[PDB]
Write a protein that binds this ligand. Structure first.
Ligand SMILES: CCCCCCCCCCCCCCCCCC(=O)OC[C@H](COP(=O)(O)OC[C@H](N)C(=O)O)OC(=O)CCCCCCCCCCCCCCCCC
Ligand SMILES: *[C@@H]1O[C@H](CO)[C@@H](O)[C@H](O)[C@H]1NC(C)=O
Ligand SMILES: *[C@@H]1O[C@H](CO)[C@@H](O)[C@H](O)[C@H]1NC(C)=O
Ligand code: ALF
Ligand SMILES: [Mg+2]
Lengths: 815, 324
């Protein structure tokens, strides 16, 4: 209930046509983005680790822990800032437009964003309306106008509106004669088809004639005017309150299942690290209880270590152990997954299959964070006019058949009427001849409580009693409005649940006469049930943007309507038939690569660290690193970083030629199988077994009193180098065995990693620089390789460690 | 118009290997048959090495060194008799072992200055921060800084063979060539100032636990300071609480007689190193070597176990897949 005067002349508290779709400003951006980023557990942890390493102690260097975190923060900040500046630029176009206002008996021109409620406005032919107008008159008689809403329902049929009978005659002839009227309206709502109101037009002396206002008088925002020279309307809703601006809902954020699994694995490994550190510090302070086990006359504390507070000492030792064993959670993974996501997205643009000579353009990638998300789609929501039909498109029926063969459920959400919407569904092979149409339109609900009886009849006594293809639901937007909004009157049997079960147990669902927001409501309703089904939405019109921004991954067709949905989506293909190739092969490959990379990155560091934790039982729990600082720094940077990146950027697990020709293979990764508890436990136990085998095999080897033909003993750096060599060879050969698509790049990287490791060991060991405070590794590697016993032991260990994998490979080839 | 490059279109030629049970089955047999003979050879080699260890720490009233456990101003001497059953023919290496001695502790490993032992003049007069509290003594920097150098094993061991009569005959032991050639000739050098060794260490002092300064260890100038073989050998860490270090070398006699004929021997030792303070043990090991090194059956046992577990599994899988 709001009152507005036509000319603001009396016979307020409203906004001012200002559309903002952005979230960050031009100053608060940094504090808000940093707060949003550092709230995550991984980003907090890395920081905490960097600060503790800087403050208390570090084994190798603070730079190797401070630089990659900064790079990771910077890349994401740049991405978010650019994607928000794009929305700022887009809003700048919608605002700062030209409109013509008759303020005081003259055709004043103002800026579009300065509209205030209650002023008569004039728009010429083919001009988009600036706000919610109410028709006062027209250039011609009969008070009619032809308006097409290409941005509200998706079609381009010529609708008709009727002017006010008492006001048709006012055409540029004293229309601002202090026209006494009061437009009493209803509060704005997203119904888009309901409107109650009344006019209080007065006469020269006095009048009280009041004509009711309905949907035939509202002139909606974002609908172009056609076949009319000029009209005159009165703004009632202006900005963030128009029926067009209410159905936006914004974009919150999109995360992948692989990304969530990474966080879960990080949370598990955090507990593993805490348990390791606590056990080590407890055993250390139990072992130091003996008077002669600390300061045994051959190494004594510099008085400080004695004068330090005992209570602070356990906390310092705990921080030192956490820093020493912090390597089990690699920052390299994050830095790498960033490069992989950035570089691998180029293949979609480069692909020659996504090319249409008519549009003379190719595919387009707006974000690179859903490449793995393309390979986990479960539900597909399609738009009828523009996407499915152009008659049908080139391969609309066969693409739907292929999608059905892959185990996906295809729903058609449109804004067209049922009469023309149902025939299109009957032509896309979505509705066969022998299927019973389960119909819930407005043609059968002319009341309120008939729906509850109908739902009970068609769910409880019709269908679940049992034929899985026969029943296909057909619904209307009007019925869905009551189903959604009026479901909070009874609680014994929830309307949403009893309607969701019949939707989900049906073969296909068609929904006609739907507002832009109701599509996002349906998509959101689907997303919450029984876990987390993964949804994909495809559209080409501006009314599809609400459901594109709500689904897990949004695809936007580059069509004749415009690029409104092409820039707001994640990917863009200039056809509908391209979807089969886009998500059958590319998504499968991306998901396989990223899952294998994550699993290998965790396993490679767990097996790296376990021997070092086992070593503490043979020293005095003094936090003595087993390896050299150079090896600790260089392990994840050059020795093992390149083979996994080369594997995860180009590796055909299954050749794309048979991936595209066999849609059935999409079901092998349907439920995130590659990152499940089974594989996680298998990789963790493999790493734990190999880590134990390394350390104990070398410990039993180091009880000889000599390993050379000249009778000379070895130090601890030789022990560490033996363990490190066995480690590097085992972790490289594991991936070499797992590789299935060997290119020249894979050969080069995999063999060059080992060759470079050997050459770097020989080069670092043998030259005194000198710029270091110590020369512990002067000749360790070259002296280590002069013994047949060590050669044979290493050769035996690189086979003992891989025996589980070799046995599993064989067992996976029978029964 | 798009570039039809194999790299851009994901069409790079590849090998695409497909390993199967019917093609990897002979590997399980060949590995076992190449591994078993190696294991047998290695385990047989490990059994033809003779070795004896003599524990001479004391801590027992029936031991001759119980009088050596706690002297005051008396330089203690022991003598332990022992017998050899089978003579030693190969080369003989003298070792000394310590137990419950943590050479790999963090506070003890890093307590050294590797640059000063390299002959650096700047580091000669001022030692590094890490080697504390053995950085300065009596307002004079110690030449070898750190506990790793300060606590060196300093016992004197001499072997005596008892002939047919009661007159013992000594055995010649050589101190040269027991340390790594590379870290003896490159990593450990002497200060370059002057020819006489005593005047090179002017602003330095001997360690606290020392008895004579570091430039008087041996008469030969080649093994006098920072090059002494025992010093260099002790400077190398141990990696385990129980370890052994090379002490002397016994060389072959010119004639074909065995190097150590069987019989009774005498071990006169000079008990200077206290080890009972932290429940440690001292021992001396006389051992021969071979192409592989010391006596340890672990390698042969592991090779035999791996070969057997591979061959049996291969046979089992061969008899199982025969159903098709
Ligand atoms: C807007 C979108 C853009 C998104 C990306 C586009 C392009 C980006 C390019 C950026 C290039 C690299 C980014 C720099 C950030 C890394 C900086 C850096 O040095 O990190 C150092 C890290 C070290 O971590 P860690 O060892 O795992 O352990 C960390 C633990 N917390 C600790 O305590 O310490 O180590 C690492 O994070 C490893 C570095 C990355 C791994 C890949 C490097 C491979 C190169 C190999 C080098 C030589 C190869 C020689 C081998 C020969 C083989 C043929
Ligand atoms: C031998 O070294 C020990 C350990 O420091 C020391 O106590 C003893 O006095 C030394 N014997 C000498 C220098 O004769
Ligand atoms: C070593 O001890 C034995 C045992 O009595 C003795 O005969 C011999 O003279 C001693 N040698 C030295 C150099 O003290
Ligand atoms: F063209 Al529509 F909903 F009818 F996108
Ligand atoms: Mg449209």
């Amino acid at each position: 209930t709001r009152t507005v005067f036509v000319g603001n002349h009396p016979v307020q508290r409203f906004c001012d046509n200002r559309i903002v779709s952005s979230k960050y400003t031009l100053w608060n951006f940094l504090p808000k983005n940093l707060f949003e980023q550092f709230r995550r557990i991984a980003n907090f942890y890395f920081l905490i680790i960097f600060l503790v390493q800087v403050t208390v102690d570090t084994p190798t260097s603070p730079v190797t822990s401070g630089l990659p975190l900064f790079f990771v923060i910077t890349v994401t900040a740049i991405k978010q800032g650019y994607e928000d500046w794009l929305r700022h630029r887009a809003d700048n176009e919608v605002n700062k437009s030209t409109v013509y206002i008759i303020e005081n008996a003259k055709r004043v021109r103002k800026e579009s964003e300065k509209i205030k409620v209650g002023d008569v406005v004039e728009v010429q032919a083919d001009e988009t309306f600036p706000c919610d107008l109410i028709l006062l008159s027209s250039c011609t008689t009969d008070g009619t106008c032809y308006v097409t809403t290409a941005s509200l329902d998706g079609e381009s049929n010529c609708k008709t509106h009727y002017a006010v009978r008492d006001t048709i005659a006012l055409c540029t002839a004293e229309s601002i004669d202090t026209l006494r009227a009061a437009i009493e309206c209803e509060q704005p709502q997203p119904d888009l088809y309901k409107f109650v109101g009344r006019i209080n037009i007065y006469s020269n002396s006095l009048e009280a004639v009041a004509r009711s206002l309905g949907p035939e008088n509202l002139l909606l925002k974002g609908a172009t005017l056609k076949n009319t020279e000029k009209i005159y309307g009165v703004a009632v809703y202006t900005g963030m309150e128009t029926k067009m601006a209410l159905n936006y809902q914004g974009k919150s954020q999109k995360r992948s299942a692989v990304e969530k699994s990474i966080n879960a694995f990080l949370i598990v490994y955090l507990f593993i690290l805490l348990t390791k550190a606590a056990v080590c510090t407890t055993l250390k302070y139990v072992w130091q209880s003996t008077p002669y086990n600390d300061e045994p006359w051959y190494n004594q504390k510099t008085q400080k270590e004695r004068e330090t507070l005992k209570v602070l000492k356990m906390f310092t030792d705990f921080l030192s152990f956490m820093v020493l064993f912090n390597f089990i959670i690699p920052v390299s993974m994050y830095v790498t997954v960033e490069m992989q996501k950035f570089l691998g997205s180029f293949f979609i643009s480069w692909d020659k299959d996504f090319y249409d000579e008519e549009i003379n353009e190719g595919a387009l990638v707006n974000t690179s964070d859903l490449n793995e998300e393309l390979g986990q789609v479960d539900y597909v929501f399609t738009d009828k006019t523009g996407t499915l039909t152009e008659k049908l498109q080139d391969q609309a029926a066969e693409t739907i058949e292929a999608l059905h063969a892959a185990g996906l459920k295809v729903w058609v959400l449109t804004g067209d009427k049922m009469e023309t919407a149902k025939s299109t569904c009957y032509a896309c092979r979505l509705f066969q001849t022998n299927t019973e149409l389960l119909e819930l339109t407005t043609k059968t609900i002319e009341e309120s409580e008939r729906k509850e009886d109908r739902l009970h009849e068609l769910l409880i006594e019709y269908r679940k009693k049992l034929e899985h293809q026969e029943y296909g639901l057909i619904i209307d937007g009007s019925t869905l409005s009551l189903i959604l909004n009026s479901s909070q009157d009874s609680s014994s049997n929830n309307y949403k649940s009893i309607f969701l079960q019949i939707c989900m147990k049906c073969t296909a669902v068609l929904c006609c006469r739907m507002a832009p927001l109701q599509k996002a409501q349906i998509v959101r309703m689907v997303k919450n049930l029984k876990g987390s089904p993964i949804t994909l939405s495809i559209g080409d019109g501006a009314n599809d943007v609400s459901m594109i921004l709500e689904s897990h991954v949004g695809i936007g067709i580059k069509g004749k309507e415009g690029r409104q949905a092409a820039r707001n989506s994640d990917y863009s293909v200039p056809k509908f038939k391209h979807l089969k190739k886009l998500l059958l092969a590319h998504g499968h490959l991306y998901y396989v690569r990223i899952a294998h990379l994550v699993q290998y990155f965790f396993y490679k560091n767990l097996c790296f660290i376990l021997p070092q934790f086992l070593y503490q039982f043979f020293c005095g729990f003094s936090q003595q690193p087993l390896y050299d600082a150079a090896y600790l720094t260089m392990y994840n940077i050059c020795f093992t970083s390149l083979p996994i990146l080369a594997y995860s950027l180009l590796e055909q697990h299954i050749n794309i030629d048979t991936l595209t020709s066999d849609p059935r293979l999409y079901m092998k990764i349907s439920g995130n199988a590659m990152l499940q508890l089974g594989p996680f436990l298998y990789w963790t136990f493999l790493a734990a077994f190999e880590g134990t085998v390394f350390f104990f095999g070398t410990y039993f080897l180091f009880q000889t009193a000599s390993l050379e033909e000249n009778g000379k003993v070895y130090g601890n750096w030789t022990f560490g180098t033996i363990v490190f060599t066995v480690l590097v060879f085992t972790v490289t050969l594991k991936l070499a065995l797992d590789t299935r698509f060997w290119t020249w790049i894979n050969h080069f990287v995999i063999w060059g990693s080992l060759a470079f490791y050997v050459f770097f060991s020989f080069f670092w060991g043998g030259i005194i620089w000198p710029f270091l405070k110590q020369q512990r590794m002067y000749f360790v590697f070259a002296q280590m390789l002069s013994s047949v016993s060590t050669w044979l032991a290493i050769i035996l260990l690189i086979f003992i460690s891989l025996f589980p994998e070799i046995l599993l490979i064989v067992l996976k080839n029978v029964r | 118009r798009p570039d039809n490059t194999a790299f851009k279109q994901q069409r790079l030629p590849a090998w695409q290997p497909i390993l199967t049970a019917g093609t990897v089955l002979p590997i399980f047999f060949i590995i076992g048959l190449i591994f078993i003979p190696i294991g047998i050879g290695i385990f047989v080699t490990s059994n033809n090495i003779r070795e004896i260890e003599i524990d001479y720490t004391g801590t027992e009233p029936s031991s001759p060194c119980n009088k050596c456990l706690s002297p005051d101003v008396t330089p203690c001497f022991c003598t332990i008799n022992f017998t050899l059953e089978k003579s030693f023919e190969g080369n003989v290496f003298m070792y000394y072992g310590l137990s419950n001695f943590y050479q790999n502790h963090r506070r003890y490993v890093k307590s050294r200055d590797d640059s000063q032992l390299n002959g650096d003049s700047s580091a000669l007069l001022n030692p590094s921060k890490e080697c504390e509290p053995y950085r300065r003594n009596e307002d004079k920097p110690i030449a070898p800084c750190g506990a790793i150098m300060n606590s060196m094993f300093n016992d004197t061991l001499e072997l005596f063979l008892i002939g047919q009569d009661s007159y013992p005959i000594p055995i010649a032991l050589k101190k040269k060539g027991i340390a790594w050639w590379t870290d003896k000739n490159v990593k450990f050098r002497n200060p370059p100032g002057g020819d006489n060794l005593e005047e090179r260490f002017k602003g330095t002092t001997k360690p606290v636990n020392w008895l004579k300064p570091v430039y008087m260890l041996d008469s030969d100038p080649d093994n006098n300071g920072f090059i002494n073989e025992d010093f260099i050998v002790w400077m190398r860490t141990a990696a385990l609480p129980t370890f052994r270090k090379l002490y002397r070398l016994i060389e072959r006699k010119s004639d074909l007689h065995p190097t150590l004929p069987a019989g009774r021997y005498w071990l006169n030792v000079t008990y200077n190193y206290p080890v009972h303070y932290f429940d440690g043990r001292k021992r001396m090991i006389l051992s021969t070597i071979s192409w592989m090194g010391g006596k340890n059956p672990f390698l042969g046992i592991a090779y035999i176990a791996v070969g057997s577990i591979s061959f049996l599994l291969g046979v089992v899988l061969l008899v199982i897949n025969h159903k098709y």
